[PDB]
Amino acid sequence: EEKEILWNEAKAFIAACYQELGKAAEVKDRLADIKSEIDLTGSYVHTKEELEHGAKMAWRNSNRCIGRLFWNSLNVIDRRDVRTKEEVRDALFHHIETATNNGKIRPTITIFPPEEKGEKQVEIWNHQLIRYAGYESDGERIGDPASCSLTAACEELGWRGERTDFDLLPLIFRMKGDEQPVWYELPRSLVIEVPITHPDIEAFSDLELKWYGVPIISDMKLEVGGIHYNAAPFNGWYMGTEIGARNLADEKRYDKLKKVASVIGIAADYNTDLWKDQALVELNKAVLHSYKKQGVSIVDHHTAASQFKRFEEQAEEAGRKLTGDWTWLIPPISPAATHIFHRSYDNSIVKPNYFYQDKPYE
Amino acid sequence: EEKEILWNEAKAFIAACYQELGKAAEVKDRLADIKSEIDLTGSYVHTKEELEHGAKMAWRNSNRCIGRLFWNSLNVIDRRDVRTKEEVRDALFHHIETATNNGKIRPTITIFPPEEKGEKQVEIWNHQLIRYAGYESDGERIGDPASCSLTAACEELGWRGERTDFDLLPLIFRMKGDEQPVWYELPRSLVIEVPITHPDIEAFSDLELKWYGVPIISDMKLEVGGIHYNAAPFNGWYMGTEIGARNLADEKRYDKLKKVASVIGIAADYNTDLWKDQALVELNKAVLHSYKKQGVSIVDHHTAASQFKRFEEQAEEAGRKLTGDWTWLIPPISPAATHIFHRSYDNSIVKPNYFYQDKPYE
Ligand code: HEM
Ligand code: HEM
Ligand SMILES: CN(C)c1cccc(CNCc2ccc3ccc(N)nc3c2)c1
Ligand SMILES: CN(C)c1cccc(CNCc2ccc3ccc(N)nc3c2)c1
Ligand SMILES: C[C@H](O)[C@H](O)[C@H]1CNc2nc(N)[nH]c(=O)c2N1
Ligand SMILES: C[C@H](O)[C@H](O)[C@H]1CNc2nc(N)[nH]c(=O)c2N1
Ligand SMILES: [Cl-]
Ligand SMILES: [Cl-]
């Protein structure tokens, strides 16, 4: 029943993967071994080659990702050998340091042991490995509202935030067999942050905005050939609009546009003045400038779309169908100035891929 | 076969329309008369009430339109009585004058006789009643590229444009029974145009940009209760981004962003400077300012989205399902600053509605 779904996914994945690696001759014997491994054990184990190419294919198939041109240079770290919470913690610390790479960000994924019988071996509670806490009590909002429920769960576990607007959440995860997760403070030496300044407007630093260097998404499931890697944190570098048009701008996040309008010296009184739009552009210019000034990788949305056009061209040249989610591929700033806006994309789901999964808290 | 599709659409429309007008008692007898009219004649004729409410319902059901809050105040002009090309021309001139209303634009639709057996009585060739010509020969681009094929068709018919960037195309339409359409120059006294200036930047007038006041879309088919009104030009007022983010900005339209960047004094050299985004905001601010200064109706995209939220609320309160096309409802400038971006919409097609139809030329 599960052995069948597994075997089917395995056949489809091994054939495609080995074809891409020029190993098509070896498919028959590999499939043989897998068939017997599933019968005898209920699952099968990927070779390091399969796992690495699977994680790359999964990125290539992520419909909502504009950054896919670089799928084949993903740095895959195989941590299927971890058994203890100290090993998990150290692997997550390592991922941070190696992905950060002193600012020259390396797209990286660390892959932990996969689910067995739907039973997780390691369950990561963080949304990203580096993320700010959020607090909301009696009229008072502090930090990142998107982090309120995770922050409250951490404080249930004896963590306590300083209640600045930028408290770093601890790493928090649970091991199989433990009733409760454990948490560990992030060593500050590992976390690069960027203060936001503006190239022309000196007063912009008065807002005391900053953001962290590397987004390391840690709550998605990587599925490859029927094997479910629920713990497999990965990162790229930011596209600037994620920080400037959403994290710092959204009313339900840091909600900074009125403050930006004031420091750039425009009124925030009339919709027809387009002050939100002007403030968005200046905040986004500041974000790109600040990351560049500090030597931390970042891409602007025009360059990102130009790279994505090359991804489309490369897909066609390779004879692979392109899939994509137009609603997520268009940037939230000047979308009609990118080619993405003016074409359509087939939003079909192809595996290997990355998937949402239920939060373990809340 | 056609009588059946017709009767079915008629039943569904009359029931809904009379329910909305509180006339539900009259449905049975009206349906009786319609049934007999279809049998004996192959079609049926709407009452003036049905036609007016049908055109309003069709606007209310237009998934891609952000301006729908005002659906019930559509001004419906019934021109089912026209038989001659002089009457058509005069009705189109009249629509322009009454919709323009000296700048205080009235949303209006003029409805011409409907198709008989799929046979058009009047076939309008213009995309909008007021639109600029476009020319493209040997490296030289003049005017609006989107108008190139219609412009060439007009010049086949003995029209000749002055080849400015803003030549007004003639009205062009064909009567049933004529092999060729006729064309008529627009009287300049009927056409309001707005020069684009910027509230703060004096040099912006150097670009010598202008646009026309009223968009009167004249190539869509209005379908109401199975009756096909292929000729039924309608207008609202502009949302500013249509002019500033698309008509004047698109590379395949007037392509003005590099020129805007230069007059606003920013470099157009580096994607990371976000110069296209900054130029877009300034051009859009100029457009709203210029229309307002001249007393010509226009709405900015924030206010438009706020009105659309009220449309959603009104639909819910009335017990009607809301339908919408998220990809067209989001504005092309700061879309994530509107509520539209953050919710989803059911893109189902409900009739009465407005539909694309095949161009009669090209
Ligand atoms: C190299 C730099 C990268 C850039 C600039 C980039 C850019 C983006 C952006 C802008 C989004 C939209 C998310 C949002 O709007 O919040 C996105 C979505 C996504 N990216 Fe990438 N990305 C990169 C690398 C990666 C990598 C390395 C992976 C995995 C190996 C990945 C997988 C995804 C996935 C799965 C989504 C969709 C997430 C969801 O549905 O919530 N990306 N990417
Ligand atoms: C009162 C002011 C109005 C505003 C501000 C408005 C705004 C808009 C906008 C911005 C669009 C998107 C089109 C584009 O991006 O190029 C649109 C689409 C549309 N509007 Fe409205 N609209 C208004 C009135 C009307 C009226 C009076 C009707 C018909 C009675 C109408 C029917 C439509 C239709 C059918 C579409 C979709 C056209 C297509 O698929 O190409 N609108 N509207
Ligand atoms: C809480 N919140 C705002 C949230 C919650 C769940 C999912 C998301 C969307 N995740 C966006 C995402 C995923 C992968 C990325 C890889 C690289 C990159 N630059 N951005 C990514 C953004 C948000
Ligand atoms: C040539 N071109 C750019 C084109 C061709 C066909 C269809 C369209 C989209 N029409 C947009 C439209 C329709 C109705 C409107 C009513 C009011 C308003 N302010 N804008 C409208 C825009 C474009
Ligand atoms: C195919 C693709 O979705 C297409 O470019 C659409 C996107 N949404 C749009 N939205 C508006 N308002 N106008 C357009 O012309 C388009 N084009
Ligand atoms: C439901 C609705 O489509 C939703 O708000 C989407 C739109 N597209 C998006 N695109 C990105 N990049 N990020 C988002 O959070 C969303 N939200
Ligand atoms: Cl983020
Ligand atoms: Cl237009």
Side-chain angles (χ1 to χ4, degrees):
Chain A
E1 69 298 346
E2 49 170 335
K3 293 194 242 137
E4 280 71 24
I5 294 191
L6 183 62
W7 171 234
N8 284 334
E9 295 286 342
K11 284 193 285 187
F13 166 70
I14 293 293
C17 171
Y18 280 31
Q19 192 58 253
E20 290 187 20
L21 301 176
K23 288 184 136 211
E26 320 188 18
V27 171
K28 173 168 163 47
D29 283 347
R30 175 50 172 159
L31 284 180
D33 302 350
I34 294 185
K35 214 187 174 176
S36 157
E37 186 165 0
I38 295 179
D39 289 333
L40 302 177
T41 85
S43 197
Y44 73 104
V45 182
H46 285 131
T47 68
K48 302 176 85 54
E49 230 194 358
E50 285 159 5
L51 176 67
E52 176 185 353
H53 199 63
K56 291 173 170 182
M57 289 168 85
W59 180 12
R60 187 177 80 202
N61 283 329
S62 296
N63 289 5
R64 287 170 165 182
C65 178
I66 193 175
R68 291 179 276 162
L69 176 63
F70 307 116
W71 67 274
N72 201 34
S73 53
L74 184 63
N75 175 33
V76 177
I77 303 177
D78 173 11
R79 288 322 302 282
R80 288 177 294 169
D81 61 318
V82 316
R83 295 298 178 265
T84 74
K85 50 188 56 79
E86 294 84 11
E87 293 164 346
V88 170
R89 173 201 60 201
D90 290 352
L92 295 172
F93 285 168
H94 176 76
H95 184 126
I96 292 167
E97 179 179 85
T98 190
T100 296
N101 193 31
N102 296 128
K104 204 184 161 56
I105 293 173
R106 296 186 271 240
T108 301
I109 179 168
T110 296
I111 298 180
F112 289 107
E115 296 175 356
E116 256 208 17
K117 39 131 53 185
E119 188 174 20
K120 302 180 161 48
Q121 305 304 289
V122 179
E123 169 192 279
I124 297 167
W125 288 29
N126 306 82
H127 165 65
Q128 286 177 31
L129 298 188
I130 303 167
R131 193 68 158 167
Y132 302 125
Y135 310 88
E136 211 279 320
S137 84
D138 42 48
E140 312 307 330
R141 296 158 77 74
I142 301 175
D144 191 341
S147 298
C148 281
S149 48
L150 176 58
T151 300
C154 292
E155 299 197 313
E156 284 305 310
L157 296 163
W159 183 76
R160 174 76 181 190
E162 282 169 53
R163 289 167 161 70
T164 77
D165 274 338
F166 306 102
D167 293 344
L168 296 167
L169 277 167
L171 295 181
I172 164 156
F173 57 90
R174 186 182 62 80
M175 302 300 297
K176 179 186 64 179
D178 289 342
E179 197 149 293
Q180 291 283 53
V182 283
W183 57 267
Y184 302 101
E185 278 296 336
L186 288 174
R188 296 220 46 126
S189 68
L190 285 187
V191 177
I192 284 187
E193 286 180 300
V194 179
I196 304 314
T197 57
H198 188 279
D200 310 306
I201 301 165
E202 182 67 24
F204 208 95
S205 52
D206 290 341
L207 295 184
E208 301 188 59
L209 305 181
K210 73 182 172 179
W211 204 252
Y212 51 85
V214 190
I216 310 173
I217 280 71
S218 56
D219 60 4
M220 296 183 82
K221 167 173 293 182
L222 162 65
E223 181 177 341
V224 172
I227 300 297
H228 290 244
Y229 298 96
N230 65 286
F234 60 83
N235 67 279
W237 49 79
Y238 268 118
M239 182 169 78
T241 49
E242 298 178 81
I243 297 162
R246 309 294 317 277
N247 297 345
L248 294 176
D250 278 1
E251 292 182 5
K252 287 160 71 71
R253 304 288 301 287
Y254 282 77
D255 193 24
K256 298 288 183 172
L257 291 186
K258 286 193 190 200
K259 283 171 181 197
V260 171
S262 177
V263 296
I264 72 177
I266 66 181
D269 292 336
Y270 304 90
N271 286 347
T272 47
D273 285 343
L274 306 190
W275 65 264
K276 281 179 182 189
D277 314 81
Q278 188 166 343
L280 281 163
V281 175
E282 298 306 333
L283 177 57
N284 280 282
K285 280 165 61 187
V287 163
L288 295 164
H289 166 72
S290 299
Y291 273 65
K292 172 68 158 74
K293 176 194 274 148
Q294 178 157 332
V296 178
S297 303
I298 193 159
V299 66
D300 67 89
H301 52 288
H302 306 290
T303 300
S306 286
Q307 289 162 345
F308 187 70
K309 177 75 172 83
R310 302 208 285 290
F311 176 69
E312 300 180 23
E313 291 159 359
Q314 163 189 105
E316 183 72 351
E317 292 156 11
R320 290 184 298 263
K321 288 182 174 163
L322 172 77
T323 57
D325 184 342
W326 188 97
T327 72
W328 282 56
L329 291 169
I330 60 162
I333 294 306
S334 314
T338 68
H339 79 284
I340 293 167
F341 185 92
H342 304 270
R343 63 156 285 181
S344 58
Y345 295 88
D346 165 17
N347 191 26
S348 300
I349 305 310
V350 182
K351 293 168 175 191
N353 214 325
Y354 297 96
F355 296 93
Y356 286 164
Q357 53 190 340
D358 294 345
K359 286 182 173 200
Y361 61 92
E362 144 195 339
Chain B
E1 69 298 346
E2 49 170 335
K3 293 194 242 137
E4 280 71 24
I5 294 191
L6 183 62
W7 171 234
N8 284 334
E9 295 286 342
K11 284 193 285 187
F13 166 70
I14 293 293
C17 171
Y18 280 31
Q19 192 58 253
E20 290 187 20
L21 301 176
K23 288 184 136 211
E26 320 188 18
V27 171
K28 173 168 163 47
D29 283 347
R30 175 50 172 159
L31 284 180
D33 302 350
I34 294 185
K35 214 187 174 176
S36 157
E37 186 165 0
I38 295 179
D39 289 333
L40 302 177
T41 85
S43 197
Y44 73 104
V45 182
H46 285 131
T47 68
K48 302 176 85 54
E49 230 194 358
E50 285 159 5
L51 176 67
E52 176 185 353
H53 199 63
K56 291 173 170 182
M57 289 168 85
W59 180 12
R60 187 177 80 202
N61 283 329
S62 296
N63 289 5
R64 287 170 165 182
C65 178
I66 193 175
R68 291 179 276 162
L69 176 63
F70 307 116
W71 67 274
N72 201 34
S73 53
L74 184 63
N75 175 33
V76 177
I77 303 177
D78 173 11
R79 288 322 302 282
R80 288 177 294 169
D81 61 318
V82 316
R83 295 298 178 265
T84 74
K85 50 188 56 79
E86 294 84 11
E87 293 164 346
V88 170
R89 173 201 60 201
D90 290 352
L92 295 172
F93 285 168
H94 176 76
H95 184 126
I96 292 167
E97 179 179 85
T98 190
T100 296
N101 193 31
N102 296 128
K104 204 184 161 56
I105 293 173
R106 296 186 271 240
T108 301
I109 179 168
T110 296
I111 298 180
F112 289 107
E115 296 175 356
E116 256 208 17
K117 39 131 53 185
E119 188 174 20
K120 302 180 161 48
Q121 305 304 289
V122 179
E123 169 192 279
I124 297 167
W125 288 29
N126 306 82
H127 165 65
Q128 286 177 31
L129 298 188
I130 303 167
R131 193 68 158 167
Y132 302 125
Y135 310 88
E136 211 279 320
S137 84
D138 42 48
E140 312 307 330
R141 296 158 77 74
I142 301 175
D144 191 341
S147 298
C148 281
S149 48
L150 176 58
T151 300
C154 292
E155 299 197 313
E156 284 305 310
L157 296 163
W159 183 76
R160 174 76 181 190
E162 282 169 53
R163 289 167 161 70
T164 77
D165 274 338
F166 306 102
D167 293 344
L168 296 167
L169 277 167
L171 295 181
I172 164 156
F173 57 90
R174 186 182 62 80
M175 302 300 297
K176 179 186 64 179
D178 289 342
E179 197 149 293
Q180 291 283 53
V182 283
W183 57 267
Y184 302 101
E185 278 296 336
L186 288 174
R188 296 220 46 126
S189 68
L190 285 187
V191 177
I192 284 187
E193 286 180 300
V194 179
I196 304 314
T197 57
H198 188 279
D200 310 306
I201 301 165
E202 182 67 24
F204 208 95
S205 52
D206 290 341
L207 295 184
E208 301 188 59
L209 305 181
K210 73 182 172 179
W211 204 252
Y212 51 85
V214 190
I216 310 173
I217 280 71
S218 56
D219 60 4
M220 296 183 82
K221 167 173 293 182
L222 162 65
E223 181 177 341
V224 172
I227 300 297
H228 290 244
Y229 298 96
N230 65 286
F234 60 83
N235 67 279
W237 49 79
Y238 268 118
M239 182 169 78
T241 49
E242 298 178 81
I243 297 162
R246 309 294 317 277
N247 297 345
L248 294 176
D250 278 1
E251 292 182 5
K252 287 160 71 71
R253 304 288 301 287
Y254 282 77
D255 193 24
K256 298 288 183 172
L257 291 186
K258 286 193 190 200
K259 283 171 181 197
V260 171
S262 177
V263 296
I264 72 177
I266 66 181
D269 292 336
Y270 304 90
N271 286 347
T272 47
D273 285 343
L274 306 190
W275 65 264
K276 281 179 182 189
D277 314 81
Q278 188 166 343
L280 281 163
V281 175
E282 298 306 333
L283 177 57
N284 280 282
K285 280 165 61 187
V287 163
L288 295 164
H289 166 72
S290 299
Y291 273 65
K292 172 68 158 74
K293 176 194 274 148
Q294 178 157 332
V296 178
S297 303
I298 193 159
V299 66
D300 67 89
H301 52 288
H302 306 290
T303 300
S306 286
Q307 289 162 345
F308 187 70
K309 177 75 172 83
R310 302 208 285 290
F311 176 69
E312 300 180 23
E313 291 159 359
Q314 163 189 105
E316 183 72 351
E317 292 156 11
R320 290 184 298 263
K321 288 182 174 163
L322 172 77
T323 57
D325 184 342
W326 188 97
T327 72
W328 282 56
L329 291 169
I330 60 162
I333 294 306
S334 314
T338 68
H339 79 284
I340 293 167
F341 185 92
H342 304 270
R343 63 156 285 181
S344 58
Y345 295 88
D346 165 17
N347 191 26
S348 300
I349 305 310
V350 182
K351 293 168 175 191
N353 214 325
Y354 297 96
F355 296 93
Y356 286 164
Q357 53 190 340
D358 294 345
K359 286 182 173 200
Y361 61 92
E362 144 195 339

